[PDB]
Design an enzyme around this catalytic site. Structure first.
Site, short mmCIF file in Angstrom:
data_model
loop_
_atom_site.label_atom_id
_atom_site.label_comp_id
_atom_site.label_asym_id
_atom_site.label_seq_id
_atom_site.Cartn_x
_atom_site.Cartn_y
_atom_site.Cartn_z
N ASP A 170 27.20 40.60 42.99
CA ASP A 170 28.52 40.07 43.54
C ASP A 170 28.89 40.73 45.15
OD1 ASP A 170 28.41 38.72 41.16
OD2 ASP A 170 30.06 39.98 40.49
N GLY A 196 42.93 31.34 36.59
CA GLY A 196 41.84 32.13 36.67
C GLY A 196 41.99 33.46 36.13
N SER A 200 35.25 33.75 46.12
CA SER A 200 35.24 33.14 45.00
C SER A 200 34.66 31.70 45.20
CB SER A 200 36.46 32.91 44.43
OG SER A 200 36.48 32.08 43.06
N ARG A 234 41.91 37.83 36.42
CA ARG A 234 42.42 38.90 37.22
C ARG A 234 41.29 39.85 37.72
NH1 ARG A 234 44.77 44.13 36.73
NH2 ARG A 234 46.49 44.13 38.23
N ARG A 275 35.39 29.17 43.75
CA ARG A 275 36.58 28.25 43.30
C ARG A 275 36.72 27.41 44.41
NH1 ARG A 275 39.24 31.39 41.29
NH2 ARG A 275 39.91 30.56 39.18
#
Ligand SMILES: O=c1ccn([C@@H]2O[C@H](COP(=O)(O)OP(=O)(O)O)[C@@H](O)[C@H]2O)c(=O)[nH]1
Ligand SMILES: *[C@@H]1O[C@H](CO)[C@@H](O)[C@H](O)[C@H]1O
Lengths: 39, 365
Positions: free
Chosen positions: B110, B189, B255, B191, B257
């Site tokens: 990541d 979402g 993200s 944390r 998202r």
């Protein structure tokens, strides 16, 4: 380690963070490092 | 109070929109130039010296070794995240037939690896999906465009198949036009960064303004990880589209998202300007989305949501431009051609002869 936060285990697996890496626990029916393979 | 805020915001919109220029002279972008600035900047530090065998051997520790040799793909046997390797391989495998030999250290973690405040033999090159200005990593389109994004109840095999997601969300955005969307801030979402907290707490205090709750992720350690609330259910990408005001935050890095929100034709409020994917550079604040500085306050949220609730046409125009940008400039073809253009420019930097390495395994095709 914080690699489990990003949900690396597929197909219902659970994750544990080591210091170096992560490890998946895979439900019966799935295998692989990420539970990506059918058993 | 309300008037000074309004002047400030409208001033920024007008200036951003007067100064805006499309990422390509023609909307179809045949020479794949839309995101070209980012790949040039990522590769620039290597232009004068180039990349030596030693640099690669030194960088190997920072990711998975991939090798194109004789139009065949080889790789370290051990991939740390196999699903992410599969997603990356979906894009490399069809390019290998028409690409010169090269060594690629592709980080599938990541977080990026080459800190430029260390430097250090953190010289690289190493490819990572996300970075800020603090890192030398070269960005590449993330695995998740095909496979191996985070795994959830709704997407147990990992969030992927951007091609199918695009159609799904196009249809859903058409099904729920602006006027029908709920006039509330929405976020659902986990944390993965504490920059997310103030929006959740604001939601608990004022649920008629913001609907924001924490889910549980696979790294859950204690109830502090949902700020002492019971974990909330996952909400599908399609169901995000029933809200006007969709929030996005960094996690560990950027993200996945964000891209999904635009395709709802909802107004995207993007928090923070540090963490990048390769396409973020051409998303321009006030043109395509509403920027918020990191660690937004509850009062900032209240002011900005109030403003847009009272300037609905404005809200819709930005939302529409956001949608249009991702629809037209984050196609699969854009993902594929960025990869190609990146690897073609990278290879010219190599100042050594790529040799086989027999410990690597054959991937394809
Ligand atoms: O209810 C949810 C929760 C998460 N996600 C998606 O699942 C991934 C993981 O989200 P999370 O907030 O857990 O981590 P992030 O990647 O944002 O740090 C992201 O692509 C989210 O958009 C989703 O679609 N619905
Ligand atoms: C979890 O992982 C994905 C990418 O690995 C990223 O979208 C988030 O930043 C991280 O929380």
């Amino acid at each position: 380690g914080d690699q489990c936060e990003s949900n690396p285990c597929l197909n219902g697996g659970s994750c544990k963070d080591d210091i170096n890496s992560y490890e998946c626990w895979c439900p019966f029916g799935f295998e692989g490092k990420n539970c990506e393979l059918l058993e | 109070n309300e008037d000074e805020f309004s002047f400030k915001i409208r001033r920024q919109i007008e200036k951003a929109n007067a100064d805006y220029k499309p990422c390509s002279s023609d909307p179809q972008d045949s020479d794949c130039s839309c995101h070209a600035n980012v790949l040039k900047r990522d590769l620039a530090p290597y232009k004068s010296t180039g990349v030596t065998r030693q640099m690669i051997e030194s960088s190997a520790r920072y990711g998975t070794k991939y090798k194109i040799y004789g139009h065949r793909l080889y790789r370290d046997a051990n991939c740390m995240f196999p699903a992410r390797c599969e997603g990356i391989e979906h894009f490399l495998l069809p390019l290998v037939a028409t690409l010169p030999d090269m060594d690629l250290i592709i980080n599938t973690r990541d977080y990026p690896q080459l800190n430029a405040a260390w430097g250090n033999a953190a010289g690289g090159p190493v490819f990572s999906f996300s970075k800020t200005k603090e890192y030398r990593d070269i960005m590449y389109p993330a695995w998740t465009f095909w496979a191996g994004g985070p795994a959830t109840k709704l997407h147990p095999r990992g969030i992927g198949r951007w091609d199918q997601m695009r159609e799904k969300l196009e249809k859903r955005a058409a099904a729920i036009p602006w006027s029908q969307k709920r006039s509330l801030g929405f976020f659902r979402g986990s944390r993965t960064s504490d920059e997310r907290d103030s929006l959740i707490l604001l939601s608990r205090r004022n649920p008629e303004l913001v609907e924001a709750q924490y889910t549980k992720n696979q790294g859950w350690k204690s109830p502090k990880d949902t700020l002492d609330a019971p974990a909330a259910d996952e909400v599908s990408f399609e169901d995000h589209c029933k809200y006007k005001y969709l929030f996005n935050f960094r996690g560990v890095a950027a993200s996945f998202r964000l891209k999904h929100l635009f395709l709802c034709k909802s107004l995207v409020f993007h928090v923070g300007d540090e963490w990048q994917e390769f396409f973020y550079d051409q998303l321009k604040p006030w043109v395509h989305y509403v920027p918020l500085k990191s660690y937004p306050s509850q009062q900032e949220y209240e002011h900005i949501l109030s403003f847009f609730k009272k300037n609905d046409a404005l809200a819709q125009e930005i939302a529409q431009r956001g949608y249009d940008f991702i629809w037209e400039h984050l196609r699969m073809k854009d993902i594929k051609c960025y990869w190609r253009k990146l690897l073609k420019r990278y290879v010219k930097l190599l100042q050594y002869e790529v040799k086989p390495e027999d410990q690597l395994i054959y991937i394809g095709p």
